[PDB]
Amino acid sequence: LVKNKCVNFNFNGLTGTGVLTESNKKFLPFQQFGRDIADTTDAVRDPQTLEILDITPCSFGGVSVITPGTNTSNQVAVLYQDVNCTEVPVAI
Amino acid sequence: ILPVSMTKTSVDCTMYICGDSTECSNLLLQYGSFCTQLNRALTGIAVEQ
């Protein structure tokens, strides 16, 4: 098992990549995995320990920069668009 | 009542079409520059709004 990390998940036979985390949702015994509106999976039960977990897709986002002007100076600063600062350095 | 602003949207068209697949991403490059044209149109929409 892997938890709280960007990984890929298969479970009963479906596919997806993201981060797993503990979930507050309570499912009925027949329920296998949670599906959100527009037909996108968001929750899945662990078949071994019989525990439900949430699904968060990979923290995608475009990269943007700011610049006062080429002829003004050569310095520059960069803005990451809608990403938490915790996992930024994965940029390589 | 007069509407003045709509939630501006931008799309990672490479991700939307190819679905982060290497060969799929390679193939779409043969269709020219719709990729960048649509992105710049959307960013123009946002800045204009």
Binding site: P57, F60, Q81, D82 | K8, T9, D12, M15, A46
Partner: peptide
């Protein structure tokens, strides 16, 4: 504001914050 109410990021789709916030407007 309390009367008006109906998304998030899913699979490449993005939403960008407004230039001016509700406090500023």
């Amino acid at each position: 504001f309390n009367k008006v109410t109906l998304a998030q990021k899913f699979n490449g789709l993005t939403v960008l914050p407004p230039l001016l916030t509700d406090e500023m407007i």
